[PDB]
Amino acid sequence: LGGYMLGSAMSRPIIHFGSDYEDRYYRENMHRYPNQVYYRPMDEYSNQNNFVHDCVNITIKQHTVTTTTKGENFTETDVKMMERVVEQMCITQYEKESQAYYQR
Numbered sequence: 001l002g003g004y005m006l007g008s009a010m011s012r013p014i015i016h017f018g019s020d021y022e023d024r025y026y027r028e029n030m031h032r033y034p035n036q037v038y039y040r041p042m043d044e045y046s047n048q049n050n051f052v053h054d055c056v057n058i059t060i061k062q063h064t065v066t067t068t069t070k071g072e073n074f075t076e077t078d079v080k081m082m083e084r085v086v087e088q089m090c091i092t093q094y095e096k097e098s099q100a101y102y103q104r
Contacts, residue, residue, distance in 0.1 A: 001038070004058065007093040009035045015084040026081055033082060034063050037089045042101055048094075055090040056083055 012035055015026060026033075039055040060082045064074060074082075 001058075001062070003040075004038050005041055006036055006038055007090075007097075010037070010089045010092055013085055013088040013092075015081065015088075017081070017084075022081075026085075029078070029081075034059055034086060035089075037086050037093065038062060039090055039093060042098065046094075046098070046101075051094060052087055052090050055093075056086045059086045059090070 012030055014030075016023065017026075019025075037055055037059040039051065039058075042051075045051060045054075060079055063082070064079075067074065
C-alpha cells in the first residue's frame with residue numbers, strides 16, 4: 001500500500017448464499033469480518049470490474065495479512081463470503097464518489 005485510499009465503513013451488506021445455515025454463518029462472523037474497503041482514487045484506472053477485483057483483493061488480502069499477525073489463517077469459504085460483501089462495498093464507493101466524478 002503505497003498510499004491507496006480507505007473509503008469508509010459501509011452499512012454491512014448481507015449476502016443470501018442460499019442456506020439459512022450460511023445466513024447465520026455470515027451474520028455471526030460479520031463482526032470479525034471487514035466493514036470498510038480499500039481502493040486507489042479514480043486517478044489512473046476507473047474500470048467497472050477491474051477497479052472492483054483489485055480493491056476486493058487488496059481489502060481481503062490486507063485483512064489476511066492483518067490477521068496472520070494474530071496467528072489467524074482464513075479459509076476459501078470465509079474468503080468467498082468476504083468477496084461477495086467487499087465487492088458490493090467497493091461498487092457502492094464506485095457509485096457515491098464516481099457519480100460526483102461523472103458530473104461534468
